[PDB]
Amino acid sequence: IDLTGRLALVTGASRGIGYFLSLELAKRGAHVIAVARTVGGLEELDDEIRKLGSSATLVPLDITDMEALDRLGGTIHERWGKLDILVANAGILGTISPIGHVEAKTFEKVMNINVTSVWRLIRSVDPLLRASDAGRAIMLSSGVAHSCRAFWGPYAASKAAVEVMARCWAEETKKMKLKINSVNPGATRTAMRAQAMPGEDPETLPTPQSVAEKIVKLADPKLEVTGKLFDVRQDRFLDYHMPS
Ligand SMILES: [Br-]
Ligand SMILES: [Br-]
Ligand SMILES: [Br-]
Ligand SMILES: [Br-]
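A: This is the predicted complex of the input protein with bromide ion.
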């Protein structure tokens, strides 16, 4: 997959999948705009990016700072005039507990970060993605969005909302060059261990690098798929099914 001359925006870039996917994108010639909360974490990512032939644009910001997201879109437009790849990876787990035990502040934060800030980002860079000759949006989700695991309610619901926004966006744009898909990255040996599936061996959970390596396929200008869920563990696109 050749991403030479491509511009990618990765949120939650300073750790976990966001970190490793930034690297996989950079390995393939993309220029990464790396968004995260702290400058230090972005600098650590940048050290690794510089070890490749590459260099990144570091954008520390509060993902809930809704005007900062608007400004980022303006910055990208002025400098490059388009955006080729969006990786919406920013997100928090909240706290595992019965739905009625959840703290209000935690519920509101889960929804504001996991849902509203994703929508804000979409609004900000949708025009830029349309200016690409092959815009690609990659929306990070979780298997619990569909398994509806006990005690994971707010998180599960937030990720279901993200997938539905992505599906609607894909339907609205399906005749365009833009393709939008969600991703279930599965559990990794570090990131999201607790999300391992029944029948998935905790001793052989994938490296985050190997997971990021598969996700980068969704950035391919040759990709024809839109509105689907990419299951990394199964290494294939899944179809959504109506209740019946
Ligand atoms: Br972030
Ligand atoms: Br992660
Ligand atoms: Br917890
Ligand atoms: Br539209």
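The beta strands are 7-10, 31-36, 57-60, 85-88, 136-140, 179-184, 229-231, 236-238. The helical segments are 16-27, 39-51, 66-79, 104-131, 144-147, 153-172, 208-215.
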